[PDB]
Design an enzyme around this catalytic site. Structure first.
Site, mmCIF file in Angstrom:
data_model
loop_
_atom_site.group_PDB
_atom_site.id
_atom_site.type_symbol
_atom_site.label_atom_id
_atom_site.label_comp_id
_atom_site.label_asym_id
_atom_site.label_seq_id
_atom_site.Cartn_x
_atom_site.Cartn_y
_atom_site.Cartn_z
ATOM 1 N N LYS A 54 -14.108 -27.068 -6.198
ATOM 2 C CA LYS A 54 -12.678 -27.228 -6.001
ATOM 3 C C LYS A 54 -11.887 -26.675 -7.181
ATOM 4 C CE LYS A 54 -13.300 -31.766 -6.034
ATOM 5 N NZ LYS A 54 -13.030 -33.010 -5.246
ATOM 6 N N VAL A 55 -10.601 -26.433 -6.944
ATOM 7 C CA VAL A 55 -9.704 -26.005 -7.996
ATOM 8 C C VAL A 55 -8.555 -26.970 -8.145
ATOM 9 C CG1 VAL A 55 -8.380 -24.111 -8.924
ATOM 10 C CG2 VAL A 55 -10.266 -23.626 -7.316
ATOM 11 N N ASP A 77 -16.588 -8.555 -2.554
ATOM 12 C CA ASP A 77 -15.974 -9.558 -1.699
ATOM 13 C C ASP A 77 -14.423 -9.566 -1.677
ATOM 14 O OD1 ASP A 77 -16.029 -11.435 0.274
ATOM 15 O OD2 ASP A 77 -16.149 -13.142 -1.127
ATOM 16 N N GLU A 96 -10.103 -26.330 -2.147
ATOM 17 C CA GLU A 96 -11.527 -26.623 -2.111
ATOM 18 C C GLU A 96 -12.245 -25.508 -1.434
ATOM 19 O OE1 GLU A 96 -13.003 -30.351 -1.153
ATOM 20 O OE2 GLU A 96 -11.137 -31.450 -1.535
ATOM 21 N N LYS A 139 -11.114 -24.335 -12.146
ATOM 22 C CA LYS A 139 -12.113 -24.251 -11.103
ATOM 23 C C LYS A 139 -13.322 -25.097 -11.519
ATOM 24 C CE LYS A 139 -14.729 -20.592 -8.706
ATOM 25 N NZ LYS A 139 -14.739 -19.105 -8.484
HETATM 26 O O1 LIG Z 1 -3.877 -20.473 -9.551
HETATM 27 C C1 LIG Z 1 -4.974 -19.942 -9.714
HETATM 28 N N1 LIG Z 1 -5.329 -19.149 -10.756
HETATM 29 C C2 LIG Z 1 -6.687 -18.640 -10.690
HETATM 30 C C3 LIG Z 1 -7.176 -19.232 -9.421
HETATM 31 C C4 LIG Z 1 -8.407 -19.107 -8.789
HETATM 32 C C5 LIG Z 1 -8.656 -19.764 -7.596
HETATM 33 C C6 LIG Z 1 -7.665 -20.564 -7.020
HETATM 34 C C7 LIG Z 1 -7.593 -21.390 -5.810
HETATM 35 C C8 LIG Z 1 -8.671 -21.667 -4.826
HETATM 36 C C9 LIG Z 1 -8.758 -22.906 -4.208
HETATM 37 C C10 LIG Z 1 -9.719 -23.142 -3.246
HETATM 38 C C11 LIG Z 1 -10.619 -22.162 -2.907
HETATM 39 C C12 LIG Z 1 -10.560 -20.937 -3.524
HETATM 40 C C13 LIG Z 1 -9.588 -20.682 -4.475
HETATM 41 C C14 LIG Z 1 -6.322 -21.920 -5.783
HETATM 42 N N2 LIG Z 1 -5.609 -21.500 -6.884
HETATM 43 C C15 LIG Z 1 -6.409 -20.685 -7.647
HETATM 44 C C16 LIG Z 1 -6.166 -20.012 -8.862
#
Ligand SMILES: O=C1N=Cc2ccc3c(-c4ccccc4)c[nH]c3c21
Length: 356
Positions: free
Chosen positions: A41-42, A155, A36, A58
């Protein structure tokens, strides 16, 4: 499988209320939670339109400014997608996007842990040099590609760099009587294009997470691709020692750290900046007896003294880092030139040819 608007709900903040087993677009089945953030959230899903394959989806909050931000992110990601049809430049590849009842959703390949989370779980024990080299190469490569396309990320930091696979072996450190996690495959991808900016767009005064922000930005001298190179320098130091180069929370303090670590700011940048308060007699001004002053003096030393060993490999890493952390952004090494640095003679071939 098509969710009618009665099976969709948002918390007060506007987050989609999700549960394992829920569906989106008659296609994505949620099978887990991946994290999150401020944006939303993802979640991990199986994409049933593609043989049940795993994805990271996402999901942006249903709040005005978040949805609009997400639309810029999708444009960046589409351009990357179109310019890297061969899949060879290591920026996360968007597989789909859509608007789910006002939540913008972006689908990606499922990856492993980010390079910060891996570091934290290793108790901030640093990556070994060879890993540092492979990761640095991949970063220079990925972002040289971005820069060639009139984009700046703005970033970059360790949490925005993801391992393809973060499975590790557990080793033991004699010197410190503790265990150490060592990643099995150091292949990485560059993530989080939510701030990436085209050459033609408006450049805000301040960009980057503070610890990774260059002097031109703090001094408000304008910024461009050189911004990313600086961030990369900071990232490499952090991978090599395991702690943040600039553990700072304030501008003047930040500048003093730069001076203590890297030498004097060029006069010419001081004459040019509108932030004259940080200076006095063409010289950086600060209270050496303050809390922050005593911190900086105790803890911030010349960059070269942070070397862990003194053989060639290590000497070359520091030369590249110093060139990436040149104060003057018109004089800072470019990624194209970084890729020619002697530090990178030292790669295995699979690593260099991307057989990893
Ligand atoms: O497994 C993934 N492939 C692309 C991707 C992009 C973002 C994420 C994130 C996440 C989760 C919370 C905040 C910020 C990021 C977890 N896995 C991700 C993936």
């Amino acid at each position: 499988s098509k969710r009618s608007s009665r099976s969709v709900e948002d918390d007060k903040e506007g987050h989609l209320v999700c549960r394992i087993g829920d569906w989106l677009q008659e296609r994505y089945e949620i099978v887990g939670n991946l994290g999150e953030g401020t944006f939303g959230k993802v979640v991990e899903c199986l994409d049933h339109a593609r043989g049940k394959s795993q994805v990271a989806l996402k999901i942006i909050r249903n709040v005005g400014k978040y949805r609009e931000a997400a639309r810029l992110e999708i444009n960046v990601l589409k351009k990357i997608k179109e310019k890297d049809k061969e899949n060879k430049f290591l920026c996360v590849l968007m597989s789909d996007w859509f608007n789910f009842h006002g939540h913008m959703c972006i689908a990606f390949e499922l990856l492993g842990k980010n390079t910060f989370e891996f570091l934290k779980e290793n108790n901030f024990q640093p990556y070994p040099l060879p890993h540092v080299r492979h990761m640095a190469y991949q970063l220079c490569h990925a972002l040289r590609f971005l820069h060639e396309n009139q984009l700046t990320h703005t970033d970059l930091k360790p949490e925005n760099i993801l391992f393809v696979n973060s499975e590790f072996e557990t080793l033991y450190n004699e010197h410190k009587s503790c265990e150490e996690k060592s990643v099995k495959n150091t292949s990485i991808r560059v993530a989080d294009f939510g701030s990436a900016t085209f050459d033609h767009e408006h450049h805000t005064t301040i960009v980057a997470t503070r610890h990774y922000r260059p002097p031109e930005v703090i001094l408000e001298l304008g910024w461009a691709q050189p911004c990313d190179v600086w961030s990369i320098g900071c990232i490499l130091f952090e991978y090599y020692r395991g702690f943040t180069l600039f553990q700072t929370h304030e501008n003047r303090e930040h500048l003093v750290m730069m001076e203590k670590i890297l030498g004097p700011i060029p006069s010419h940048m001081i004459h040019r900046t509108r932030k004259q308060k940080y200076f006095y007699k063409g010289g950086l001004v600060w209270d050496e007896n303050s809390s922050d002053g005593r911190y900086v003096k105790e803890n911030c030393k010349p960059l070269k003294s942070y070397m862990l060993q003194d053989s060639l490999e290590h000497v070359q890493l520091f030369d590249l880092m110093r060139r990436m952390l040149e104060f003057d952004p018109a004089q800072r090494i470019t990624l194209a030139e970084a890729l020619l640095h002697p530090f990178f003679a030292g790669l295995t071939p699979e690593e260099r040819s991307f057989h990893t």
